[PDB]
Amino acid sequence: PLTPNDIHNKTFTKSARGYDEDEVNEFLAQVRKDYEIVLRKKTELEAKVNELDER
Amino acid sequence: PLTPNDIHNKTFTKSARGYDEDEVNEFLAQVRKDYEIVLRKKTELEAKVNELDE
């Protein structure tokens, strides 16, 4: 799946008419934040479960 | 925080020489799916871990 850095690094073509760039970038910053937070929680929990199963 | 639905529902003001809408829409669709799946996996894992000791 996408990484937080993938979201941060994503670029788009500019068209004669398109989505306001500042709005898109701000929204993607927000998505990147929330995604990274949930991803980290998931990976941290997985690591503790793995560690316990491994003993 | 955002929900996956919020990402699907997000609208942007149009502007001259803004980002191509198909490209942004396509990327947001990919992000929406990956975000939905990771949220689901995290929520399921947390629930199940808390069910281990009966």
Side-chain angles (χ1 to χ4, degrees), chain B residues 7-28:
Chain B
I7 299 173
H8 177 66
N9 296 157
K10 183 62 175 191
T11 61
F12 305 104
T13 308
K14 314 306 169 297
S15 78
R17 295 203 50 259
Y19 291 139
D20 184 81
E21 304 179 26
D22 282 345
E23 289 181 15
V24 168
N25 287 339
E26 186 158 334
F27 185 63
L28 283 183

Side-chain angles (χ1 to χ4, degrees), chain A residues 1-2 10 12-21 23-25 27 30-31 34-35 42 45-46 49, chain B residues 1-2 10 12-21 23-25 27 30-31 34-35 38 45-46 49:
Chain A
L2 290 162
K10 186 75 181 187
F12 312 96
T13 304
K14 304 178 181 185
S15 301
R17 197 185 310 158
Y19 290 141
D20 182 275
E21 298 166 22
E23 290 183 13
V24 170
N25 296 150
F27 183 72
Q30 175 178 32
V31 177
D34 296 339
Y35 191 70
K42 163 181 191 287
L45 196 45
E46 281 172 353
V49 175
Chain B
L2 289 158
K10 183 62 175 191
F12 305 104
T13 308
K14 314 306 169 297
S15 78
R17 295 203 50 259
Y19 291 139
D20 184 81
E21 304 179 26
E23 289 181 15
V24 168
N25 287 339
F27 185 63
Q30 177 188 12
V31 175
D34 288 352
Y35 183 46
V38 85
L45 220 213
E46 278 207 296
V49 158

